[PDB]
Amino acid sequence: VKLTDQQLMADLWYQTAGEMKALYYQGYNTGQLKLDAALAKGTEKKPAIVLDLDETVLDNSPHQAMSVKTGKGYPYKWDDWINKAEAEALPGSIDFLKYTESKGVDIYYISNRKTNQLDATIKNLERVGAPQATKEHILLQDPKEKGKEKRRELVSQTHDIVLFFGDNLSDFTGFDGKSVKDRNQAVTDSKAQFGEKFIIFPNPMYGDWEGALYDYNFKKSDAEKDKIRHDNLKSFDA
Amino acid sequence: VKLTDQQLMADLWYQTAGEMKALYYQGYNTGQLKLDAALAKGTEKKPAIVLDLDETVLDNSPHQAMSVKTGKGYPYKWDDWINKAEAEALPGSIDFLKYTESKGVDIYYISNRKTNQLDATIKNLERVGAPQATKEHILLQDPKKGKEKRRELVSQTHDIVLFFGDNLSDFTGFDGKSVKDRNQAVTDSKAQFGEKFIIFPNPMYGDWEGALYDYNFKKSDAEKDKIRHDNLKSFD
Ligand SMILES: [Mg+2]
Ligand SMILES: [Mg+2]
User: Fold this and answer.
1) Residues of the domain holding A158
2) How far is B139 from chain A (nearest CA, A)?
3) Quick one: which residues bind Mg(2+) (chain B) (predicted)?
4) Is residue A238 less than 8 Å (CB to CB) from chain B?
């Protein structure tokens, strides 16, 4: 079995579909509307927004394409990719971030890139013209750090985070390490937050939705993953 | 070679990912906000909204999952599936539609289901609690091109304040364009998304795929496989 072939349509959609681009504009448009609303409501502390990087601001789909072509999945040559620092900005992101900056709102890029990829990450953010592309605003993941809550909490110490942007539920508060059933129920419970405080972007290529199927164990063999993937489809029995 | 296998992750995301559900809530939440705003300002004609059905209101992913499991691509058992009228509603859809109806807004389900699938479609919509599940509000495909004619028809008597869909051709201005041109059209219309055009994620199938084939699905699995690979952009 070649697991990477199973990614192909998801990757192809993400890389080529205008629908994908439209969803990014929709997310950033909605985020801008909600940013204005939040500023008009006012805050107790200095306003901030938080964004994930990969598949929220920066497009890493060329790496996923590489995995399809080579048959070698993530993280094969992921660090090589990060070091090239050539991911493109996703639709709407830069203009939204420049708008945010124009309103005096601080931006925090909370990303699970490794802290030792900061230089490459700054390089890529400078290349795409993302504001506040500095160590003070780019909060990467420490080795052994679980999730992002620690960085969110740090930001919330000094800022009232009025919006979160991401492609993975764990880019928002309240969705860490849950089973498929539990994270899905959590979405239902927090349904009012989406498009309000949590601005979500589509990423069918990879993420916690997949990790959750493996109980977050990617050390599973390819054969194991293949069975899990098949077993979790809900098929029409004609 | 086993072309259906290439859909597996797209389907699995759509069927299982909480992120998918959140995107549906996001879209319908935004829809409600924008509907209220539109109603506050008033319209010249009676307000309406337009929704696509498949992968917008009704979830057909069990059919696509079946395709993967059996290795049998479209149209295998599609009509069977439609006839079973057992698709579930997509997250947020039904409460949004009920809200909409309560505001005196007419709903038009403009769908490229075939006009001979109307009874099944009504059945399925009734089953999930979609309001206005009647022939007057469900505008299915005439075998004699796209949905613009139906949209224009509704616009004669209603001011359509919102459009909902998973495929760009669910909105005006995206019919039969190349990948390059439909993508540029999205850029050109970027302000509309989340404002007048509410989009939902569907990586399983759609005009995004059709456009890669120049809308000619009379291709072998081997032909589609080559196109698909050639349109992935790797790095050096
Ligand atoms: Mg991400
Ligand atoms: Mg549809």
Assistant:
1) 1-238
2) 23
3) 52, 54, 166, 170
4) yes
Record the resolution, in angstroms: 1.6
Chain B residues 182-211 with CB within 8 Å of chain A: 182-183, 185-187, 190-191, 193-195, 197-204, 206, 208-209
**A47 interfaces chain B, CB cutoff of 8 Å:** no
Cα A80 to chain centroid distance, Å, stands at: 20
CATH code assigned at A125: 3.40.50.1000
Question: Residue A51 C-alpha to ligand 1 middle, in angstroms?
Answer: 9
Chain B residue with Cα closest to A62: B234
Paired tokens of A175: 């969705």
Range list of H helices, A17-169: 18-41, 61-70, 78-84, 93-102, 118-128, 149-158
Determine the Cα–Cα distance for residues B149 and B154; give it in Å rounded to an integer: 9
Helix (H) or strand (E) holding B165: strand B158-165
Ramachandran category for residue A111: left, alpha or beta (phi over 0 → left; psi -120 to 50 → alpha):
beta
Q: How many domains are contained in chain B?
A: 1
Q: List, in order, residues 6 or more apart from A107 with CB less than 8 Å away.
A: A48, A49, A50, A51, A97, A100, A101, A131, A132, A137
Contact B232 A15 (CB under 8 A): yes
